[PDB]
Amino acid sequence: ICGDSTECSNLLLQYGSFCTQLNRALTGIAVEQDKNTQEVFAQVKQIYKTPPIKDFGGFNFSQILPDPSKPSKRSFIEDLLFNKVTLFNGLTVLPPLLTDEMIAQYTSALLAGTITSGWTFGAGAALQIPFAMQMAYRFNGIGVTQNVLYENQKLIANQFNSAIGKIQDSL
Amino acid sequence: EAEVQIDRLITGRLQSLQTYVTQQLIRAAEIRASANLAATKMSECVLGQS
Amino acid sequence: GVSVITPGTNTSNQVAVLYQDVNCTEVPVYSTGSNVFQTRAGCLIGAEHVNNSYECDIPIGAGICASYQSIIAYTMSLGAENSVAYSNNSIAIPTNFTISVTTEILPVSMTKTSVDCTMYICGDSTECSNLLLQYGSFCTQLNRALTGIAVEQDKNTQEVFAQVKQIYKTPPIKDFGGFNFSQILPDPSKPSKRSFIEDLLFNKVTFNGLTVLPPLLTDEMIAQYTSALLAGTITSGWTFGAGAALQIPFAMQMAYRFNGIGVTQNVLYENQKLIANQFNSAIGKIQDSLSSTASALGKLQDVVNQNAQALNTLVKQLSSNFGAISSVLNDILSRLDPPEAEVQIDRLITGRLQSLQTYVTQQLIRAAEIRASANLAATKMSECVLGQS
Amino acid sequence: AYTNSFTRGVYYPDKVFRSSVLHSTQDLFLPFFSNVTWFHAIHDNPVLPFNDGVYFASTEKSNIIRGWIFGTTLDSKTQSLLIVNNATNVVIKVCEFQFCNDPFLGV
Amino acid sequence: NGLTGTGVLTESNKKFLPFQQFGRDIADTTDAVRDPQTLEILDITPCSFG
Amino acid sequence: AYYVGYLQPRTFLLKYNENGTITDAVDCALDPLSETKCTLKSFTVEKGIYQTSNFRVQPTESIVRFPNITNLCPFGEVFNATR
Ligand SMILES: *[C@@H]1O[C@H](CO)[C@@H](O[C@@H]2O[C@H](CO)[C@@H](O)[C@H](O)[C@H]2NC(C)=O)[C@H](O)[C@H]1NC(C)=O
Ligand SMILES: *[C@@H]1O[C@H](CO)[C@@H](O[C@@H]2O[C@H](CO)[C@@H](O)[C@H](O)[C@H]2NC(C)=O)[C@H](O)[C@H]1NC(C)=O
Ligand SMILES: *[C@@H]1O[C@H](CO)[C@@H](O[C@@H]2O[C@H](CO)[C@@H](O)[C@H](O)[C@H]2NC(C)=O)[C@H](O)[C@H]1NC(C)=O
Ligand SMILES: *[C@@H]1O[C@H](CO)[C@@H](O[C@@H]2O[C@H](CO)[C@@H](O)[C@H](O)[C@H]2NC(C)=O)[C@H](O)[C@H]1NC(C)=O
Ligand SMILES: *[C@@H]1O[C@H](CO)[C@@H](O[C@@H]2O[C@H](CO)[C@@H](O)[C@H](O)[C@H]2NC(C)=O)[C@H](O)[C@H]1NC(C)=O
Ligand SMILES: *[C@@H]1O[C@H](CO)[C@@H](O[C@@H]2O[C@H](CO)[C@@H](O)[C@H](O)[C@H]2NC(C)=O)[C@H](O)[C@H]1NC(C)=O
Ligand SMILES: *[C@@H]1O[C@H](CO)[C@@H](O)[C@H](O)[C@H]1NC(C)=O
Ligand SMILES: *[C@@H]1O[C@H](CO)[C@@H](O)[C@H](O)[C@H]1NC(C)=O
Ligand SMILES: *[C@@H]1O[C@H](CO)[C@@H](O)[C@H](O)[C@H]1NC(C)=O
Ligand SMILES: *[C@@H]1O[C@H](CO)[C@@H](O)[C@H](O)[C@H]1NC(C)=O
Ligand SMILES: *[C@@H]1O[C@H](CO)[C@@H](O)[C@H](O)[C@H]1NC(C)=O
Ligand SMILES: *[C@@H]1O[C@H](CO)[C@@H](O)[C@H](O)[C@H]1NC(C)=O
C-alpha cells in the first residue's frame, strides 16, 4: 500500500496497529496447512520394505508398487496423476515443509505394511501372514465363509488383475 | 490535497486487503474440514476393515 | 523476511538467522558469521551442515530442519527402517499382552462476551449519538451476532455434557475384583468433590463498554455429571445408556469386553492378577506423566490466549488518531468549531466501525471452529464411553 | 582513552506508575555496550559538544569536581547557564559572563 | 491537575515512589491518583453500568 | 576522571517491578535475540522459529535515457545573418 515511501508510511502509522493481525492470520493458516498434511500422512512410526521375491498367491501388484527406475521413485498411477493436472509486489509463496519424496515414501510404507502384515501393524507391532490367509479373513468378516475363497482363487486373481488394468486404462 | 489523495488510496487498498484475507480464511476452514474427513477415512479404511 | 532459529533462552543464547527466498550473495556481527548454507528456502547463517539425519523438532522447510546438539541443520529422517521377512507359509502369533492408558484433551466452549453498541464509539457524548443516527441500523446488525454466539455456546456445552437422565452413586464398599479406582472417584475431603486428576488439571493452567457473561453450567454440576457417568460405566457396564441400569460384577464385564475384541473370556479369568497389577501400574504412571511434564494442554491455553489477544487488540485500537488531529472526542468538541468537528467525528466513527466489524468477523470464525470441535467431542463421548468401539 | 559502557544510562522516561508490566519505550537512551571517553584531571577541562543530551559519570572520591558551564558561543553575547556547588547548597543562574581561558573558583 | 475523567473515588493501599503523580495499568487507563493538597494515593473505579 | 556519553533515539524494553522500580532493560537494535524479545514482548523465548522483520535492498544510483533528437533549426542562423 506504500511501495517504499516515507510520507506514505508516516500517514499510515496513525491508523493504529492493524497489520499485526493481517500477518498473524496468514502465519496461522500456513501452520494449519502444515499440521493438516502432517496429521493426514504421518501415521506409522517405521518404514517397511517389500521383499525382493513377490508371490502373493497369484495377485499382481506391479502397477501399484514403487518403480525402482525413476529418480523420484514413484509408482505408475502416481506418475499419471502428476502428469494429468498442471497449472512480485510484496507477496511471497512459502515452500511446503514435506517434499514429494517424503509423501511417496509414506505411501509406499503404508502399502507395504497393509500388503504384508494385514491390519496387525496398525495396532502395535507388525505381524507377518500369507496373503491368501488374509483374504480368507476378509471374506469371513463380511458373512461369506472361507470355504469359498480357497476353491475360487484363480477367478478372484484374474478379476482383480482385469479390474486394476481397466482402472489404469480409464485414468 | 495530496494528503486527501493518499488517504483515499490507502482506504481503498485496505478494504481490498481485508476482503482478500476474509476469503482466504473461509477457504482455509473448508480445506481443513475436508482434510480431517480424508484423514479419518484413511485411518478407518486402510489400517483395518470398514 | 528474516527469521531467527533459537534453542530457547533457557539452554543458551546462541541463534542462527535465516534469510528467506534470497540467493544471498548480497548478504549485507552476522554479516558473514559462521558458514553460509544456501538452501531451497533461502539461506541460513549461524549453523553448520552435517550429512547425518535424525528426527528434528525445529522445522525449517523444503525437507530440511535444524536443532541444537552448537546448532546444526540437516535433512530430516522419516523414522527407523525395518523389513519384515515375508514368507508364504509362516505366521507370527503373540504370546503375551499389556494394558496401556492414554489421554486426549478436547475443547468444547470459550468465554461468552459482549460489547456495548454505542458506548464503544461515543464515550458518553451527545454529538456522537446524534451523528450515529445517520448510519442506518448497524447497531442491531453488530449486536445480534454476539447473543447468537452466546446461546450457541450454552446449548453446545449443555448437549455435550448432559447425556444421563439420572444421577448414579457408587456403593460405599469398593471391591472391584482387585482393580483400584480410588484415584478416579470423587474425593469427599475436597468441598468441591473433585477427583485428584481433576485437581491437577485445574492447577496445571493459570471496562470500556465490554463485558463477559457468566456460564450457565457451573463447575460443580459438570463434576457431578462426570461422576455420574463414571459411576454408571463402572457399575452397570454399558446397559445404562440404552434402558435402565442393570448391575453386573466387574470381572464378568471385563470378560465380555475381551470377548468383544476376539480374545476368549478364559484368558481374563486365568490372568486376573496380572491384569489388575498392570492397570494399577499404568494408572500410577499417568499421574506422574501429567504432573511432572507440562505443555500437555496446549489447545486450551492457545484458545484462551487467542481470545485475550483479540480483546486486547480491540481495546487498544481505541487510542488511534485515525487521521484526525486528536484521539479524544471531548477535547475536539470543546476546543474546535463545529463545521469541521462533524468531519473529525465522522472520521473517528468510520474507523471505529471498521475495527468493530473486523472483530465481529473474527469472533464468528472462531465460534464456528469451536462448534465443530465440540461436535466431534460429543460424538466421541457418545460412542467410546457408553459402549465399545 | 576509550572505555566500554556495558549497561549504564537508563532513566525513568515519565512520571507514571506501573507494576509488573513489560513496556516498550522509544526515546533518547545511551546505547548498551557503547564507547565512552575518559578524561584525566591531572597535569583536563576541554570544550565538549552537547549533541542533544549528555551523560556524566564522575567517580573521584576527593571533592574536586564542582560544576558545569553551558552555552552556544561562551561569550557575553549569548546567555550561558551556570551551576556551582557550595558544599552545602547549589546555585544556578543563566545570565551572561565573559569567557576566561582558565575558568576557576574562589571562596 | 489536568488529568480529567469520570468515575468513583475510593481509598487505596498502593505505594508510590516519592516522584510519581498518577499510575496506570495498561492501554492508558488511570487507576491511581494522589491529591496535591494532601499527597494521598487514591483509586479510580469506572462508574457502574449494564 | 569523568566519562562522557552521547544519547541516541533508541528503543528499549523495560520490566517494572511490583514496587514500580525499573529492574531490567533490554535493547532492541543490537542482536537478533533482542529483536525476537521485542517482537515476543517477553524476556523468555521458547524453542522454535520466529518471524521478526523483513529487509529490502536500497537503490544505489539513478540513470535516465533520451533520444538523440538532433534537429537544430535556423534559430541559430538568424543571429549570424549578414544583412
Ligand atoms: C503384472 O502386470 C504388469 C503390467 O505392467 C506386467 O508387466 C508387463 O506386462 C506385459 C504384459 O504381458 C509384459 O509384456 C511385460 O513384459 C511386463 N513387464 C515386465 C517388466 O515384466 C507384469 O508382468 C505382471 N506380472 C504378473 C506376475 O502377472
Ligand atoms: C522367523 O524366522 C525367520 C527365519 O529365520 C526370521 O527371519 C530372519 O531372522 C533372523 C533372526 O534375527 C534375522 O536376523 C533375519 O534378518 C531375518 N530375515 C530377514 C529376511 O529379515 C524371522 O525374523 C523370524 N521372525 C521372528 C518374529 O522371530
Ligand atoms: C507377560 O509380561 C508380564 C510383564 O510384562 C510378565 O509378568 C512378569 O513376570 C516376571 C516373572 O514371573 C516378574 O518378575 C515380573 O514382575 C512380572 N511383571 C509384571 C508387570 O507383573 C508375564 O510373566 C509375561 N507372561 C508370560 C507368559 O511370561
Ligand atoms: C489404591 O491406591 C492408593 C494409592 O496408594 C492406596 O492408598 C493408600 O492406602 C494406604 C492404606 O489404605 C495408605 O497407607 C497410603 O498412604 C495410601 N496411598 C496414598 C498415596 O495416600 C489405596 O489403598 C489403593 N486401594 C486398594 C484397594 O489397593
Ligand atoms: C497545603 O496547605 C495545607 C494547609 O496548611 C497543608 O495541610 C496541613 O499541613 C500540615 C503540614 O505539617 C499538617 O501538619 C496539617 O495537619 C495539615 N492540615 C490539613 C487540614 O491538611 C498541606 O500540607 C499543604 N500541602 C503542601 C504543603 O503540599
Ligand atoms: C518493596 O516495597 C516494600 C514496602 O516499602 C519494601 O518493604 C518490604 O515490604 C514487605 C511487605 O510488607 C515486607 O515483607 C518486607 O520485609 C519489606 N522489606 C524491607 C526491607 O522493609 C520492600 O523492601 C520493597 N522491595 C521488594 C522487593 O519488596
Ligand atoms: C531449562 O533448562 C534446564 C537446565 O538446562 C532443564 O533441566 C530444563 O528441562 C529446561 N526447561 C525447558 C522448558 O527448556
Ligand atoms: C546466486 O547468484 C550468483 C551470482 O550473484 C550466481 O552465480 C548463482 O548461480 C546464484 N544461485 C542461485 C541458486 O540463484
Ligand atoms: C557430505 O557428503 C558430501 C557427499 O557425500 C560431501 O561432498 C561433503 O563433503 C560431506 N560433508 C560432510 C560435513 O561430511
Ligand atoms: C570502541 O569499543 C571497542 C570495544 O569496547 C574498542 O576496542 C574500541 O577501541 C572503541 N573505539 C572504537 C573507535 O572502536
Ligand atoms: C556560595 O559561597 C560564596 C562564597 O562566600 C557566596 O558568595 C555565595 O553567595 C554562596 N552561594 C550560595 C548559594 O550559598
Ligand atoms: C555566430 O558565429 C560566431 C562565430 O563562429 C559564433 O561564435 C556564434 O556562436 C554564432 N552564433 C549563433 C547563434 O550560432
UniProtKB/Swiss-Prot annotation, chain A:
Annotated glycosylation sites: 60
Effect ascribed to mutating residue 23 to K: In strain: Omicron/BA.1, Omicron/BA.2, Omicron/BA.2.12.1, Omicron/BA.2.75, Omicron/BA.4, Omicron/BA.5, Omicron/BQ.1.1, Omicron/XBB.1.5, Omicron/EG.5.1
Cystine pairings recorded for this chain: 2-8
Site (Cleavage): 74-75
Effect of residue 92 to N: In strain: Lambda/C.37
Effect of residue 55 to Y: In strain: 19B/501Y, Omicron/BA.1, Omicron/BA.2, Omicron/BA.2.12.1, Omicron/BA.2.75, Omicron/BA.4, Omicron/BA.5, Omicron/BQ.1.1, Omicron/XBB.1.5, Omicron/EG.5.1
Mutagenesis or variant effect for residue 121 to L: In strain: Eta/B.1.525
Function: Precursor of the fusion protein processed in the biosynthesis of the S protein and the formation of virus particle. Mediates fusion of the virion and cellular membranes by functioning as a class I viral fusion protein. Contains two viral fusion peptides that are unmasked after cleavage. The S2/S2' cleavage occurs during virus entry at the cell membrane by host TMPRSS2 or during endocytosis by host CSTL.
Record's protein name: Spike protein S2
Annotated organism of origin: Severe acute respiratory syndrome coronavirus 2 (2019-nCoV)
Top-level taxonomy: Viruses, Riboviria, Orthornavirae, Pisuviricota, Pisoniviricetes
Curated annotation (Swiss-Prot), chain C:
Residues of the full protein shown: 594 to 1037 of 1273
Lineage top rank: taxon: Viruses
Phenotype for residue 240 to L: In strain: Eta/B.1.525
Effect upon mutating residue 83 to L: In strain: Omicron/BA.2.12.1
Consequence the record notes for mutating residue 334 to A: In strain: Alpha/B.1.1.7
Protein name per the record: Spike protein S2
Residue numbers spanned by region Heptad repeat 1: 272-322
Name of the gene this protein is made from: S
Phenotype upon changing residue 321 to K: In strain: Omicron/BA.1, Omicron/BA.2, Omicron/BA.2.12.1, Omicron/BA.2.75, Omicron/BA.4, Omicron/BA.5, Omicron/BQ.1.1, Omicron/XBB.1.5, Omicron/EG.5.1
